[PDB]
Every structure is written in structure tokens, then in C-alpha cells.
């Protein structure tokens, strides 16, 4: 039987399961690092508000 | 599946914030309100007067 299109000489493998998360900080510091951007976004919110104290009664 | 049960206050607390945890962590946003709102009367320790005012008619 003449040249068909036989196999390789050889498999290479591939790709037959799952995948993964992405990055390192799995845990809750994705949570806790929020009660950092709040716990800096208050310390100058109230603080422009505290500022308006002096500006409200400036005029 | 369990829900909450609340003859252990430190087990049902427990398993409510981890099986319908949902509500919980609402009132624990709700405790931390008016409980905090206790906690200032030290913690203020005579901050501030905010001094506004409408007009003040003095006196003679
Ligand atoms: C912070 C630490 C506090 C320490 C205080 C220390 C002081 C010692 C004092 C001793 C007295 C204890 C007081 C505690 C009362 C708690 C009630 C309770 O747990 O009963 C359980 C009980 C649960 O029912 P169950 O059938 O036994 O449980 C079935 C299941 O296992 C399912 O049960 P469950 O767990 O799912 O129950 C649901 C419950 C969640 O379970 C909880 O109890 C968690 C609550 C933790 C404490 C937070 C509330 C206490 C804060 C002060 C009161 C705020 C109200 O959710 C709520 O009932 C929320 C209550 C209202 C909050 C808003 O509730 C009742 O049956 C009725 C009792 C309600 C009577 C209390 C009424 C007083 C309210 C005062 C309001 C003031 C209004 C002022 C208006 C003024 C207008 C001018
Ligand atoms: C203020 C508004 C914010 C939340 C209030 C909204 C409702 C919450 C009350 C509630 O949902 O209780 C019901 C729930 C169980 O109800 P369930 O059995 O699911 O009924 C369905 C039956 N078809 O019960 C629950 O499990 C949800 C409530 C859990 C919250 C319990 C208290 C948490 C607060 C933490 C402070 C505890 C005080 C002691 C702390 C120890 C000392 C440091």
C-alpha cells in the first residue's frame, strides 16, 4: 500500500485539563487593602470638611 | 446544609456568617454604627466647637 497520510514518528503532547488563578494575593488583603483606600479616603474627606468649618464661617 | 442556630451565641454567629452570611454582614455594619457612635466621648477627648452663627445681636 502506496504513501497516505500515515502518523508521525512521534506524539508532542498537548493540553487535556484545567486552568488557574491569576496572581499571588489570593487572600484577604484584596479585601483588606479596600479598608485601606477607605481608611485613606476619609482621613482627607472629613478633613476638607473640617476644612469647610473655617470656610463657611470665613464668609 | 445548616442555617443558623442561636443557643451557641459564639457558634451561631458562627454559622451564620458562613452559611448565609449575607445578612451578617450587614448588621455587623449595623453594630458598628451606634456602638462606635458610643465610643467617641473618650475618643474625641475635646477635638473641637464647630462655632457658626446667624447674626449676633450683642447686649448692652
Ligand atoms: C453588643 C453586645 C450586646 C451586649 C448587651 C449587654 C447588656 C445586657 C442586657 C441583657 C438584655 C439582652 C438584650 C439582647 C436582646 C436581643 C434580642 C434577642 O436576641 O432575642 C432573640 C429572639 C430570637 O428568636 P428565637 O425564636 O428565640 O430564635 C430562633 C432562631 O434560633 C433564630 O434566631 P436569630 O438568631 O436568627 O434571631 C434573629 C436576630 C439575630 O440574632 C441576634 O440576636 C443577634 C443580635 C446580637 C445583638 C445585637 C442586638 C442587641 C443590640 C441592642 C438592641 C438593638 C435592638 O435578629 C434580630 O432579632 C435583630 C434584633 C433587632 C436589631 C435591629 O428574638 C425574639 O424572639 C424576640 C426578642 C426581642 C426582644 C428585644 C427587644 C429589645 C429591643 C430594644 C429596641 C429599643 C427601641 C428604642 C426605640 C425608642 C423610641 C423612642
Ligand atoms: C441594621 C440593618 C442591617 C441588617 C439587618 C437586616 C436583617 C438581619 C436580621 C436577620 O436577617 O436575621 C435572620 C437570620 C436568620 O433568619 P432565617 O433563618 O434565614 O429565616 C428565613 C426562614 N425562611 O439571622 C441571621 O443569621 C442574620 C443576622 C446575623 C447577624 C447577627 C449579629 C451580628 C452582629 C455582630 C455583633 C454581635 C454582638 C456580640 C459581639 C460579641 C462581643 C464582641
Do not use: S
Given at each position: 500500500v502506496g504513501q497516505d497520510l500515515p502518523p508521525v514518528g512521534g506524539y508532542e503532547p498537548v493540553q487535556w485539563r484545567r486552568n488557574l488563578p491569576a496572581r499571588?494575593?489570593?487572600?484577604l488583603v484584596y479585601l483588606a487593602a479596600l479598608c485601606g483606600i477607605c481608611g485613606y479616603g476619609f482621613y482627607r474627606a472629613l478633613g476638607g470638611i473640617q476644612e469647610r468649618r473655617e470656610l463657611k464661617r470665613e464668609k | 446544609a445548616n442555617p443558623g442556630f442561636w443557643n451557641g451565641p459564639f457558634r451561631y454567629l458562627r454559622w451564620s456568617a458562613h452559611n448565609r452570611p449575607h445578612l451578617f454582614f450587614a448588621f455587623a455594619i449595623g453594630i458598628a454604627g451606634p456602638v462606635a457612635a458610643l465610643t467617641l466621648?473618650?475618643?474625641?477627648?475635646?477635638?473641637?466647637?464647630?462655632d457658626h452663627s446667624p447674626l449676633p445681636q450683642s447686649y448692652p
Open positions: 499571588g494575593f489570593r487572600p | 466621648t473618650p475618643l474625641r477627648r475635646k477635638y473641637l466647637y464647630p
